[PDB]
A paper describes a structure:
SpaP is a member of the antigen I/II (AgI/II) family of proteins that are expressed on the surfaces of oral streptococci and are key molecules for networking with other microorganisms and host cells in the oral biofilm. The structure of AgI/II proteins is unique in the sense that the proline-rich region and the alanine-rich region wrap around each other, forming an elongated fibrillar structure that presents the variable domain at the tip.
The structure of the C-terminal domain of SpaP (residues 1136–1489) was solved and refined to 2.2 Å resolution with six molecules in the asymmetric unit. The final model of SpaP-C1136–1489 from S. mutans consists of six independent protein chains, each binding to two Ca2+ ions. The crystallized protein consists of two domains, C2 and C3, each of which adopts a β-sandwich fold. In the C2 β-sandwich an isopeptide bond is formed between Lys1157 of one sheet and Asn1307 of the other. Similarly, an iso­peptide bond is formed between Lys1334 and Asn1469 of the C3 β-­sandwich. The Ca2+ ions are likely to play important structural roles since they are located in close proximity to the isopeptide bond in each domain. The Ca2+ ion in the C2 domain is coordinated by carboxylate groups from two residues, Asp1208 and Glu1211, the carbonyl O atoms of Lys1261, Tyr1209 and Ala1263 and one water molecule. In C3 the Ca2+ ion is coordinated by side-chain O atoms from Glu1387 and Asp1384, the main-chain O atoms of Lys1430, Gly1431 and Tyr1385 and one water molecule.
Numbering used by the authors: 1152 to 1489
């Protein structure tokens, strides 16, 4: 059976079809150009001249192209030359040549799409088609930051067009988690206590905590965590950072080696803090090697407690930024009175 096939992979070449993919992650889409049914073909010149194209109809509202990382290899491992790639923002913008090929093949891409085109049909034919050598196209596409603000699902589909005939690939679907960091104000540490004093008043010179709750990274995700930070530029005219902070697991976490770390476990040992005393700021950073030791199948979430002393009267606000794999996500803003 002639079948162009499409599979999504992470940067380590693991298959990630149906996995949760974080904003900022790359989909290393691998497109198969299925030519193995044409072995020994001996078509006319007119027929060969109808050309060979491949189409990827990618979801442009969710993903951005990484053009430069596009690679085409033949089944014998030779890199493929003679195939050029063009990205079109809409059908309306494609040349007539392209609109006609697509129309006569019964292919109508939704929104934006890529075309891979054999520059010389005769030569492409003689090289890969009459010999039935399948090609592999890798066309990496990054999930836009915005998908991480809204959550959502996206799908990708390809077509191959041989002698002007179109064949559709399977459709690959993934989804993106809405990362929503939260910020509470608490009077005690101890994660079990759900008390939140956002809005209330704090007596002058009270030692308290800002509770910085990280975004939830769901199980079955597509790549390794390498960064998970809590950045807090607090108002030092109101709040004095006391130099004390702790970090806790907020869901059960499973490592690559099978070791489990229960929700509530203190994770401070796997962190450092970058402190900027003049600016009045602190960044709590998970060590990259710890994050990377976590299984891609595991859920992951953590929360930091920074200990503050209220040192003046007035109304003071605070906000923090949770940075996950290079993408920033802001929390709500708390406000207390003194
Ligand atoms: Ca599209
Ligand atoms: Ca500050």
């Amino acid at each position: 059976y002639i079948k162009p096939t499409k599979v999504n992979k992470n940067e380590n070449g693991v298959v990630i079809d149906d996995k949760t993919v974080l904003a900022g992650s790359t989909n290393y889409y691998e497109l198969t150009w299925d030519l193995d049914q044409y072995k020994n073909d001996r078509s006319s010149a007119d027929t060969i001249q109808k050309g060979f194209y491949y189409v990827d109809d990618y979801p442009e509202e969710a993903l951005e192209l990484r053009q430069d990382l596009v690679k085409i290899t033949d089944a014998n491992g030779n890199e493929v030359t003679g195939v050029s790639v063009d990205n079109y923002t809409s059908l309306e913008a494609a040349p007539q040549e392209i609109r006609d090929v697509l129309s006569k093949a019964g292919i109508r891409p939704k929104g934006a799409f890529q075309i891979f085109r054999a520059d010389n049909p005769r030569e492409f034919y003689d090289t890969y088609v009459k010999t039935g050598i399948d090609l592999k196209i890798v066309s990496p596409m990054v999930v836009k930051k915005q998908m991480g603000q809204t959550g959502g699902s996206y799908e990708n589909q390809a077509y191959q067009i041989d002698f002007g005939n179109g064949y559709a690939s399977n459709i690959v679907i993934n989804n993106v988690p809405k990362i929503n960091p939260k910020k509470d104000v608490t009077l005690t540490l101890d994660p079990a206590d759900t008390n939140n004093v956002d809005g209330q008043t704090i007596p002058l010179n009270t030692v308290f905590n800002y509770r910085l709750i990280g975004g939830i990274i769901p199980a079955n995700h597509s790549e390794e965590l390498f960064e998970y930070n809590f950045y807090d530029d607090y108002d030092q005219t109101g709040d004095h950072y006391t130099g004390q902070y702790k970090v806790f697991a907020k869901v059960d976490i499973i490592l690559k080696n099978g070791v489990i770390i229960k929700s509530g476990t203190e994770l401070t040992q796997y962190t450092t803090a970058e402190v900027d005393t003049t600016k009045g700021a602190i960044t709590i950073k998970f060590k990259e090697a710890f994050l990377r030791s976590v299984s891609i199948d595991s859920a992951f979430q953590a929360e930091s407690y920074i200990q503050m002393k209220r040192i003046a009267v007035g109304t003071f606000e605070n906000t923090y930024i949770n940075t996950v794999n290079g993408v920033t996500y802001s929390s709500n803003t708390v406000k207390t009175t003194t």
